From a paper:
EHBP1 was originally identified as an Eps15-homology domain-containing protein 1/2 (EHD1/2) interacting partner that plays a central role in GLUT4 transport and couples endocytic vesicles to the actin cytoskeleton. EHBP1 consists of an N-terminal C2 domain, a central CH, a C-terminal bMERB domain, and a CaaX box at the C-terminus that is a substrate for FTase4. In our previous work, we showed that EHBP1 is an effector molecule for Rab8 family members, including Rab10, and forms complexes with 1:1 stoichiometry. Our biochemical and structural data suggest that the interaction between the C-terminal bMERB domain and the central CH domain has a regulatory role in the function of EHBP1 and binding of Rab8 family members to the bMERB domain releases the CH domain, which can then interact with the actin cytoskeleton.
Since we had noted earlier that helices 1 and 2 of the bMERB domain are sufficient to form a complex with the CH domain, we then used the bMERBH1-2:CH complex and obtained crystals (SG: P 21) diffracting to 2.2 Å. The asymmetric unit contained two copies of the CH:bMERBH1-2 complex, sharing the same overall architecture. The interface of the bMERBH1-2:CH complex shows both hydrophobic and hydrophilic interactions with a buried surface area of 593 Å2. Most of the interactions with the CH domain lie on α-helix 2, with some additional interacting residues provided by α-helix 1. An array of hydrophobic residues including L1099, M1103 of α-helix 1 and M1116, W1119, F1120 and V1123 from α-helix 2 forms a contiguous hydrophobic patch on the bMERB surface with extensive contacts to L534, M537, and Y541 of the C-terminal helix of the CH domain. Besides these hydrophobic interactions, several polar interactions were observed at the CH:bMERB binding interface, including D532CH-R1100, T535CH-R1100, T538CH-W1119, Y541CH-N1124, and Q542CH-N1127. The Y541CH side chain also forms a hydrogen bond with the backbone carbonyl of F1120, and the R1131 side chain forms another hydrogen bond with the carbonyl of G549CH. Beginning with the C-terminal interacting residues of the CH domain, we could show that mutation of the conserved D532 to alanine leads to a more than 40-fold reduction in binding affinity, while mutation of L534 and T538 completely abolishes the interaction with the bMERB domain. The side chain of L534CH inserts itself into the pocket created by L1099, R1100, M1103, and M1116 of the bMERB domain. To optimize the contacts to the actin filament and to obtain the best fit to the CH-binding pocket, the CHEHBP1 model was manually adjusted to relieve minor clashes, mainly by shifting the short helix 522–529 (residues PSDMVLLA) and the following loop, and then energy minimized with Macromodel (Schrodinger suite) and PHENIX.
Numbering used by the authors:
A (entry chain B): 443 to 550
B (entry chain A): 1071 to 1162
């Protein structure tokens, strides 16, 4: 498997069985914030209450995840307002961001 | 002082080469992603993009470790700097 495929497989393994998460790509699957928040919850459940998240709170879900990640050393590549007005998230930015999250937890 | 700046200078130079190659890999990889013109160069650029990300991450971690040490030195300079003020106060 190539670098994209292996990253996508990692995202699905880590978020497996989180309610409301459905990952099929590096764009619309990430918009609502849940997928990011599930990644955060899986590693650092002390930083976020996943069960109380509202699927329609696009800005707030994204903010919680970005702030959680920034608090452990992962640089912000996305702002919550990049999701506003139904924008499709930039593919290369989402991928790089996830790449950095996985690298952080792999000791890089 | 001596060890730190030598190492920071070298890392900061290497960081300049990384960011320079990466701007070009990005420009290109973005062009291919948007056009769909060559999914094979695309994948090869993605790989290179990520290698460059790995290098930069390893530099950043090395820099931060060194910066801690530099802060600990500086504090020590300040400790000795205070000892001088005490000395000079006694030179009557």
């Amino acid at each position: 498997p190539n670098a994209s495929q292996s990253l996508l497989v990692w995202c699905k393994e880590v978020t497996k069985n989180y309610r409301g998460v459905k990952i099929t790509n590096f764009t619309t699957s990430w918009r609502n914030g849940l997928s990011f928040c599930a990644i955060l919850h899986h590693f650092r459940p002390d930083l976020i209450d996943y069960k109380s998240l509202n699927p329609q709170d696009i800005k707030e879900n994204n903010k919680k995840a970005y702030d959680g990640f920034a608090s452990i050393g992962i640089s912000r590549l996305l702002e919550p307002s990049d999701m506003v007005l139904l924008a499709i998230p930039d593919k290369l930015t989402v991928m790089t961001y996830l790449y950095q999250i996985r690298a952080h937890f792999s000791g890089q | 002082s001596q060890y730190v700046v030598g190492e920071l200078a070298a890392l900061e130079n290497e960081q300049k080469q990384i960011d320079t190659r990466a701007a070009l890999v990005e420009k290109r990889l973005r062009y291919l992603m948007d056009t769909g013109r060559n999914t094979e160069e695309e994948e090869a650029m993605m790989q290179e993009w990520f290698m460059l990300v790995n290098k930069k991450n390893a530099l950043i971690r090395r820099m931060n470790q060194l910066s801690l040490l530099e802060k600990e030195h500086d504090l020590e300079r300040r400790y000795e700097l205070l000892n001088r003020e005490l000395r000079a106060m006694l030179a009557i």
